[PDB]
Every structure is written in structure tokens, then in C-alpha cells.
Symmetry: D2
């Protein structure tokens, strides 16, 4: 139905493309990057993390062809030259990681697009949305540049919503043991973050994250109640959130998990998941939900301090949420 | 001075041997394992984690020779046949990981040894000691089988002591992002812990740990105040403790770090360290201290919740503490 | 059809089971290992290398239930106590790694089995077979303890066959950059092979291999003409054979690749495959063929020396060849 | 003595600096990259591969201060704006990776430099040199832009020299199982080489290499006789050359190894080394030689075909050869 365009056909760009294939309401008709159709086609066909694409892929002229459907391939470094309007693209997924500021993301709008979804925390966005938590705050009339937050926030926000509405959160701190990403470095190179400058596959790398505070963006009641950090480790994909929080009401482990399980089977079905299996990160590769509670890890002290651990395929979960948001926005009128 | 014997010449056994080379008060005269002198000599000479041994190594007869010093090599599976007494071994470092129960560890005593140091949490030990925290509780007259706890507890205990004596700990939870060890599995094999059964270098593996509760063994005041877990990740060595705790007194980040830094330069010098550099796990390989505070990671909410992150070379730090304990015990009289 | 038993439900054991699900001529009614049905069921369902098994898996008291069918679980360290005869098991896949010698493998026969397939190079086996190369040499009346060779031999033999019949091999040498396996070590531990004693996920590890020599067991004409080595590297699965050989007939790269391709689309279809894609090891995880030619790597000098590179999923290709062999052996009468 | 400048303070840049500290004939007075003195100082002090630099490192306003000496830090993306002449820099090590073509490298000369050492295979260089093989061909009056070849060529050339002079090489093919480098990608990203575009730490990655052909630049007699490929694997450093060659003279493994050993203890000492130890890649990290023969791997068939395996720390060996070359070039007059 709605024509979509992806700017930055990378880990998120391609994952989003695959998710879109499952939703007949959104049609990805064009992608943009900094290489040729040949290369983008080869990357989409063979993925080191998610395997071989289950569809026919070819190159026709200077474009891609997926299961007979033709996808326009652009290679414009400057978003202003994307002419999205010219080909009827209404929604643009900004996943280059270079245009998180509104002044840059808005270039897609000048190019003819109607809505822009920044696939990451943003700067001066009209609004930040986490599906299953605050999509209702989206306002078609004023929100044109939207942020889908980070995968980490998308994992924490949902169960943080549950703990707070069910038991009340006084304060809490989190740590996300996160798989390395392309923002890091192969072997000790310059980086604004002296931590991320170090060989990604050789160390446990502590780094700062705003995912905790960003939760306040979608859950205002929690402003100033959370903070945390990240630890990048030697895994190519799949991460996990570890939250330690002080609760108002007195509770037991069973209660906490019971609340989380009910929410996952209820109002958060498809967003929050609940597992009582003793699994590891590899088992969650391909997971489409935003957050799966590792129930066996639930822990409580004095009935006031709790530890909740949740899994998330940082590439997949988030990309599926991007498509949900794109469909949600389209259904609101363009 | 005191003759030492090492049972289980592995990651800890060999690391302990190297540490002993630096202390003229302890002399390691015999090691036992399940292989031949040739093999143990080759392992001691070339280490994948700590590099080539800086000393001359050879094999003479059925024994090892390190810088001209001869080390007896035994290959007795059953500790009772070690005849430590016959060669004058008074202290035995039990690092096979198979004899953590007192009934097994005591076999070294029947063999003629006077004291046994179990290099891990134990079962029914006469006492568990963490150097810099409770070595004063050691009683030469009644403590013959001693536990040096785990490397994780050795990392947490010291700064937990400081936070509690300085600000008072109501309760706290910790998570140790830990390098894989030989207790794990290369590729999905049977293991009592269905988590540790999974390919160690391919996933982030959540696992349970008693390091938090074990802190109570050396710091009785903290009984029932702590609990936590571990996450084994794809790194061959070096781990980090992440503690989230509720404090009694109201404090600031600067205060917390100031207290930790003073303790590291004071009463805990050589045990607790303090760093304000943005480093990663590889930078701590070879670290001899038990715990180095990553000050930049210190974080506080409402002046009541704090996050303290500390580094520890799980093999090296602990092994150096084993030698300290052996010397400490010897100085108490055998 | 013919009932099979798996002794050693490990990487090959469980992969052999997966393949058997697709082969109507064979049925797995029992497996034996050193643990409980709950551990094996958990391992069968969650695989760090091949993902979640696409089938119903549960535990029936003391047995496994896969897609309704009930699999009997044994835990006999001694093959002589398996009593295969009491459950009608005719063919036993010996994949423990401990019974590669006929004296030991033959115990399954004493236990009621009729044929034993050793999943690896063996000692004193009645015959060594490489599917697609010499299954014709199989003698139902004389061969009871059969070896399915190694996965490396299964990868090399098929195209070595093609090269020799088509151009004649004077002599050659190979190196297989092979993924690590459970025969190695996590962190420097005793091992008969001092190279394999070293941390598997940390180095490139040269180790000897008899795969090249073994080719002669299935292709007599190549006796004494081939030799090689292995290099274990930090990947969990998938390997590649690198053969450099002197040919009798003068050839060009195009002619060598054409012969390999024709053989793959002809007589060796399903056993040998041919690829002109610039792929990497991760791309062959799950591959069921025994050998896939990496055509872009084919090289020639003076029209006499050639380099042929072929990929292989050491777990899947081999495990499927084992099932193929079991079905073949059965079609000959037991 | 002669003042040197390093353009590109990366893996080779910083390793070249470490080696220069030990060479009295050369002094590094300035380095150029794309960041601030604080970033470079932090990278120089903490290395994920080679550990903490054993020296005093600090920042003096806008420059580096190593063991007292002050190093000027530049940040000019355009080599033409380096003004080496104004600071007396005579020799410049071009190790950015972006200026391997003479048209670009020659800019340093236009900037006041007298000689330029390109740390890699080059295009239109006045001459390519492999230390210990053909430095004699150097012409101070005609050669201004010199290439120090690749680390792979530096590893292969020295023993290829020995084999040819001693037995005569008819033809051969090599494969270098090489550690990943910064030229690769963290997670499937565009790259001219579709193989190198794939996650470096997740697969075995075949890639082309001109190292074998390049040998002819330093050993004319071997022109058109050698060829090969590379296989990038999941290790951060250290590589190994695997050469299979047809010899003119009939030989035994013992004679080949004896020749290699004699050459290592003779004319090629310090360049070529010989080892009879069963080591692994981690053992050669820090090795300063260009090539170390793994004698246990030497193999021969029909007394004519031989396989020689040699190790090399692609970062350290090469970087030291660069310093050696710089000192040599200087001893010839600038
Ligand atoms: N990787 C994760 O787990 C994850 C999860 C959620 C959100 N994100 C966010 O999504 C964004 C992209 O992340 P990624 O991991 O996919 O990165 P990536 O580096 O893998 O992909 C980025 C793609 O954008 C292209 N690109 C860069 N500049 C371009 C330009 N100017 N014009 C057009 N194309 C250009 C690159 O060629 C590349 O293919 C970031 O903002 C990041 O923080 C990442
Ligand atoms: N690895 C760490 O980071 C770490 C840190 C602190 C404490 N520990 C503890 O120390 C112990 C050993 O750990 P490791 O990592 O060195 O293990 P390891 O497996 O590397 O070494 C154990 C050694 O003991 C030998 N051994 C086993 N059974 C034997 C027997 N019956 N008799 C004689 N020798 C035998 C093995 O051959 C091996 O060399 C464990 O209890 C463990 O929990 C480990
Ligand atoms: N992994 C590969 O790439 C590969 C490929 C081809 C052939 N092989 C061969 O197959 C065999 C097994 O290899 P793997 O990788 O599956 O090993 P593995 O260690 O993963 O599996 C072996 C299984 O056998 C069990 N076992 C051990 N002793 C036992 C006993 N006495 N009785 C019953 N069960 C016992 C273990 O518990 C384990 O689950 C070896 O001979 C090996 O060389 C391995
Ligand atoms: N890494 C090895 O194993 C190895 C061995 C031998 C030769 N080499 C060669 O040496 C060169 C560099 O390799 P590396 O591994 O050190 O790479 P690297 O990426 O680690 O280092 C390159 C450095 O150059 C800097 N740089 C890039 N453009 C610049 C510019 N225009 N001006 C100034 N600085 C700039 C980067 O910031 C970086 O720090 C390559 O040509 C490579 O082929 C690498």
C-alpha cells in the first residue's frame, strides 16, 4: 500500500526490508546507499548473521529484483537529491546513522517524502516512539520526523512500563550486554569514544548509553528514575538488558514474573515475550519481538529490589518495530 | 621457605606457579596433574593468554626444570597417593576443581600436607578467606582446609567492604560479565548447567553465581544483603563486576569514587585499585590486583542508588591472592 | 524401514538424527550418551550452530519424543551393555569418538546390532567408505564394521576423483582450514596433540590430518600420492579444503572448472556441488553436500599445477553422508 | 640520526613507531592522522593486540611526548599540506593505506621529504624491496618512492629465496591463513571485494592476494612461477604462509629443513627464523622476524613436491622491516 524508501541499506536497512516483505500494507520501492546494485544485491542475498535470503534475487539494469519485484537503487550521499516525491515515496526509513539530527533527517522531506523515521535516538525529532508504549502520542498533523529510539530502549521500555504500572519504580539502573555493531572498530582506530575505538571482537567494552534516560521520552512518569550503561562484547548479534530497580510495593519473584508473563500474553503480545527456558544469545537470533523476559534470571531482595533480565535481537526486533511504526503512521493518514 | 605443592596445574595452577616465582618465602617444589612432564612443561612455557614464560624451561627425567630449579611432577588422580609429607610439602594449593568438598580436600592432609588451600568456593571448609578483607579470621589451630573463594568474590568483597563501612549497604545486586573458563563447553555438550553446556565462544551465556552471597562469608554484616548472576561471554580471560546497590547515607558520584580511591591507596593497596582511564578488558590481562575500580563508570541516582564497576583478571589476580594466602598461612606457623 | 541406534548423541550424533528425519528408509529408535533425557532433549532443540530444530521435542519419563515418535534414551558408558538386539536396532552409528577401533566398535554387534558405522577414521575396520566414491566396494556379507571416513576426506575424495579420472593426478598436498571441534580445548589443557591443547578460539592451530592419505582407502590409484595438514581456526562450524596438485594432462582453469561442474551436475550430484559465488564460511552452514567447489579460487600454473578449493559443513554434510550410507547398506540386505 | 615522519598512525604506523624506539639510526619527530593528540596518545599507550607500551606517554598541548621526546601531531588529510621540509623530516613512512599509488605518495616529496616508504604493495613505485632479499637493488639516486611490499611477501620471499637457490623452484602455489585487518568489515558492509565485505570475526574468508606474484619483484628468477590466495580468519593478529612447490633437485624433508635452518642461522638471521616447536599463532604475537619456519610441518612427496609453512606477525615483523629499510636507505645517503 504505502510506498517506502530506505536510506542506508545496512544491518537495519536490510533487516527492515525483510520484515516489510511480510506486511502487505507497506511496499519498499527504493533503497539508497553508497555502492552499486550488484553489491547491495549480494549483501541482501547472503547474510553472515541471518543466513541466505529465502527469495529470488537478481540485478536488472541498475536496480535490484526480489522475487520479481523491482527495487530502485540510488547512491546519493546527499539526502536532498533523493527525489523521493518523484517516485511516490511517502515514508523514509533513515538508517544510515549519519542523519539523526532533524536538520539532516528533514532533507528527506524537502526531497518529496512525507514522513521520516529515524532508526535511532535522535536530536530535535518531533517525537520519539516505542511501539507498544506510546504510539498513541504520535500526531499526524505535527510529527513529520519521528524517532523509533534504540533497540535497547525498545527492549527496556516495555517491561519497565509493566513494573512501574504494576509495582511502581522508585529508581533503577541497567546494563546492556550488547553485541558489537558497525559503529565500533575492528582494530584500535580513532573514535569519539575511546572505548569503542578498541578492537570490538577482542574485549568486553564498557560504553555509555542513553537508553535508560530515553525511556523517559516514552514513559514520562519515569523521568530521572533510570540511568545505566552498556558493555559491548564479542558476539555479532543479539543483546540482553539487565535491570536492577527499587520498587514501591513489596513483591516476590513469582509475582514479578507473573506480571511480566500476563503482559506478554496480554496488552504487549508481539512486543514483550516471556520465557522460562535456560537459553543463550544465539537462541534469540531472528527474534521478532522487542523484549523477551528471561524469567529464570528474575531475582528479588527484601521484596523491594528486583533484577529483571531481557533478551533482544538488536537488528531484527527493532527492524520489525520500524515496519510496525511505518504501517501505524501510514494508517494515520499521509 | 615453605614448601608448596600444586594439585591441578591448570589455568590457576600455572598462574599460581608464576606468582610464586616472585615470592622468596614460598617454594613450589611439586605439581600434580593427569599428564606427563613433557606436556606440563610445554604448557608452562607457552600460554595463549599470558604469552611465553620469561624463564628457562626444560625436562629432566620425569620432572620439570624452571631456571635451574627442579619441580617434581606427579600424575596421581587420587590425592591420597600424593605423599606430600614424604617430600616435605606443608601447603597444598588444590586447583583441580574436582576436590572442593572438605572430604576430598582433606585427602591432601592424610597424604602428609599440613594445610590445604581450595582455589574456589568450597563445601564444609574450615574457613573461607579473601585477602584484604578477613585473613585475620584465619586460626592456625583449627583451620586446616581453607577456601580462597572465587575470583568474582575476590573482586567484589574489597570494594563492597568500603561502600558498606563508608556509606552502609541496605541491599544490592551484581552481575559479572565473565570470560569463559574451562568449566564450560566448546560446542553444545552435556553439563549440569544447561547454560554452560552451550558453545562458550558463540554466545552471551547467563549463569548463576554464589559470589554475591559468598561475600557474606568474609563480610558477615552483609548477610542476606546481596545476590546476583553472571554472564559468560566470548573472551578468553579478564572479567568485570557490575554492582547496583542501595546505600544508607546520601552521596554523590565524586564521594563514592573518592572513598574507593582512598581505600585503594590506603588499607587496600595491592588488593583494590582505582582507575579513571577509559579502558577495556584486554588492558587488564596480567593485572595482579583483585579489583580495579572503573571510576568513569561510577553512577548515582537520588544519592541513594549507586553503580560501581570493577575489573579483575580472573586467572592472575586470584592466583596472586593464593600465594599471598599461602605466605600468610605459613607465617602463622605450621 | 531399518531401525538405527546412535551411540554418542553429540555434534555428529544429533546432526545424524536431524538428517534421518528426512530419510524414509531409516528410523532412529534409540540414542545413547552420558546424561539424562532432559539434557539431550534440551540439546536437540537448541543448537548454537544450526538454530532451533524444526520439530516437536519433549521428554516422556525417561525417553525423548520427537514429532510424536518416542526415542529411547540410554546412558551406558560400556557399548557391551547397550542390548541393541532387544530393541531391533540393526544399524548403529558409532559417534562417541571413543570407539573408533574395531575391537571396541564390534561390541555393538555383540550387543545385537548387525552393522556398525564408525563416524570417523577407524582402525582395523572391515572397510572405509566415501559415499559417491566407493560404496560399490561394500560387501554385505563381509563388512560389518564400516568407517565413513572423516568429513575432510568426504570433501576431498569426490573432486580428487574427478581430477584424477579427467586429468590424472601425479601428486598433491592439501591443507584444510577447519572449524574447531570438541576434540580441542577451551584454554590450554593437556592433549596428546600439543597443538590441539591450546585455546581453540584464540589461535590458528596447525595439526596433522590423515585425510589426504585416507583418500587412498577409497581411491586406490591415489595411494601414496597425496598428503596434507589441517589448520584449526576460530569458527564453530564449516571448513574448506585447499588442494594443490600436479596434473598429467595440460589444462587451463576453465577446463578444470568445467569438469568439476559437469561432475557436480552429473554423477556426483548431491555429493559434489559447484559454486561461482564469492561466499564465505558462514554461507555454507547447513550445506548438506560433501563438497562444494569454490570455482572463483581455481588456479593453474604452466597448465600443470592446479589449486582447487572446496567448502564443507563438517557437521551437516558428513552427518547426511552417514544417513545415506546407512540406507545404502540396508538396501543390500542385513 | 635521520628524522622520520609517519603518515597514518594506525596498526602499522604505531607499530613502526615502537620499533623505531629501538633503532638509534632513526628518530620519529612527527606523525599525521585524522584525530587529536589525546586520541593518538591513548591508542599508543593501550594496544588490544600488543599490550601496554613500555614507555612514558603523555600529551603536550597539541603534541605527543614519549619518554621525554616530543612528537609533533598533524591532522592533514591531504599529504601535500604536511610540510615535512619545515621540520627536517627526510624519510616518510606512508602507512595510511590511501596513498599506495606513486602519484599520491610523491606528495610527501613535494612537501619537503626526500624519501617515501610505502608500507604496502604499490603502483608505479620506483622500487619494491624485501629486506634480506634485494635491498642491494636500491639506488639512492633514482629510488625515492619505495614500497616495502606486503607482510605476506616479506614472509614468503626469504624462504622462497632459500628453496630456489638451494633446490630451484619449478613452480608453486601458496595460501596465507591471515589474521583480519582494518581493511575488512565488522558486519557485512559494502567493499570492493565482496568477500572482505563480510563479518571478519565470523567466517573463514577467501580473498585474492598478489603476494606470490609480488615475490618476482624481489626475486626476478621466480617471475611467473608462483601464485596464491589468502584466507582471512577470526584472529586479531599473526598469520602463516603455506607454500606447496615443485623442486628441481630431489630432496628429503630433512634436507629442506636443514637448508632453511642454516639460512636462518646464517645470512638471513633476524629475517628468517626456524622453529621445531609445535606452536600456535598466539605464540608469534610480538615476533620481530619476517618469517619463522614451522619445521614440524615441512612435508615432501616423490622427493619433488614440498610444503613449507612459515609464521609471521603481520604487524610487528613488517613494521620492524620498515624501520630496517629506513635505516638502510639512510646509510646510503639522502
Ligand atoms: N545495529 C544495531 O543493532 C542497531 C539497532 C537499532 C538501531 N541502530 C541504528 O540504525 C542506524 C544504522 O545502523 P546499522 O547497524 O545498520 O549500520 P551500518 O553501518 O551497518 O549500515 C549503514 C548503511 O548506511 C550506508 N550509508 C552511510 N552513509 C550513507 C549516506 N550518506 N547515504 C546513503 N547511505 C549511506 C552504509 O553504506 C551502510 O550500508 C544507526 O543510527 C544505529 O544507531 C542499530
Ligand atoms: N579460571 C578462572 O578464572 C578461575 C578463577 C578462580 C578460581 N578458579 C577455580 O580453580 C579451579 C581450577 O580452575 P581452572 O580454570 O584452572 O581449571 P583447568 O581445567 O584449567 O585446570 C585444572 C587442572 O587440573 C587437572 N586435574 C583434573 N583432575 C585432576 C586430578 N584428579 N588430579 C590432578 N590433577 C587433575 C587438569 O588436568 C587441569 O590441568 C576450579 O575450582 C575453579 O572454579 C578458576
Ligand atoms: N565435529 C565434526 O566436525 C566431525 C565431523 C566428522 C566426524 N567427526 C567424528 O565423529 C565423532 C564424534 O564427534 P563430535 O564432534 O560429535 O563429538 P562430541 O564430543 O560433540 O560428541 C560425542 C558425544 O559422545 C558422548 N560420549 C562419550 N563417551 C561416551 C560413551 N562412552 N558412551 C556413550 N556416549 C559417550 C559424549 O557425551 C558426546 O555427547 C568423532 O570420532 C569425530 O572425529 C566429527
Ligand atoms: N595490518 C597489517 O597486517 C598490515 C601489514 C603490512 C602492511 N599493511 C599495510 O599498511 C597500510 C595501513 O594498514 P593498517 O593496518 O595500519 O591500517 P589502519 O586503518 O589501522 O591505519 C591507517 C591509519 O591511517 C589513518 N588515515 C587514513 N586516511 C588518512 C589520511 N588521508 N591522512 C592521514 N591519516 C589517515 C587512519 O586514521 C588510521 O589510523 C595499508 O596500506 C596496509 O595494506 C598492513
Amino acid at each position: 500500500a504505502v510506498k517506502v524508501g530506505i536510506n542506508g541499506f545496512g544491518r537495519i536497512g536490510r533487516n527492515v526490508f525483510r520484515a516489510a516483505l511480510k506486511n502487505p500494507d507497506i511496499e519498499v520501492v527504493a533503497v539508497n546507499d553508497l555502492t552499486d546494485a550488484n553489491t547491495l544485491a549480494h549483501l541482501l542475498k547472503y547474510d553472515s548473521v541471518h543466513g541466505r535470503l529465502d527469495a529470488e534475487v537478481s540485478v536488472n539494469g541498475n536496480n535490484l529484483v526480489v522475487n520479481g519485484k523491482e527495487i530502485i537503487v540510488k547512491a546519493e550521499r546527499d539526502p536532498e537529491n533523493l527525489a523521493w516525491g518523484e517516485i511516490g515515496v511517502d515514508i523514509v526509513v533513515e538508517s544510515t546513522g549519519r542523519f539523526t539530527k532533524r536538520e539532516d533527517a528533514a532533507k528527506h522531506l524537502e526531497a518529496g517524502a512525507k514522513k521520516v523515521i529515524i532508526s535511532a535516538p535522535a536530536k530535535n525529532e518531533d517525537i520519539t516512539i516505542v511501539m507498544g508504549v506510546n504510539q498513541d502520542k504520535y500526531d499526524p498533523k505535527a510529527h513529520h520526523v519521528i524517532s523509533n529510539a534504540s533497540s535497547t530502549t525498545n527492549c527496556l521500555a516495555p517491561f519497565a512500563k509493566v513494573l512501574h504500572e504494576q509495582f511502581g519504580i522508585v529508581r533503577g539502573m541497567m546494563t546492556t550486554v550488547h553485541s558489537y555493531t558497525n559503529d565500533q572498530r575492528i582494530l584500535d582506530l580513532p573514535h569519539k569514544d575511546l572505548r569503542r575505538a578498541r578492537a570490538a571482537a577482542e574485549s568486553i567494552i564498557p560504553t555509555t548509553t542513553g537508553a535508560a534516560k530515553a525511556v523517559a521520552l516514552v514513559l514520562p512518569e519515569l523521568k530521572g528514575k533510570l540511568n545505566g550503561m552498556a558493555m559491548r562484547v564479542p558476539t555479532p548479534n543479539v543483546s540482553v538488558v539487565d535491570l536492577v530497580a527499587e520498587l514501591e510495593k513489596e513483591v516476590t519473584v513469582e509475582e514479578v514474573n507473573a506480571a511480566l508473563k500476563a503482559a506478554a500474553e496480554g496488552e504487549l503480545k508481539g512486543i514483550l515475550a516471556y520465557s522460562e527456558e535456560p537459553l543463550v544469545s544465539r537462541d534469540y537470533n531472528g527474534s521478532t519481538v522487542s523484549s523477551t523476559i528471561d524469567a529464570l534470571s528474575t531475582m528479588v531482595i527484601d521484596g523491594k529490589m528486583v533484577k529483571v533480565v531481557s533478551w533482544y535481537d538488536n537488528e531484527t526486533g527493532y527492524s520489525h518495530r520500524v515496519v510496525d511504526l511505518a504501517a501505524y503512521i501510514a494508517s494515520k493518514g499521509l
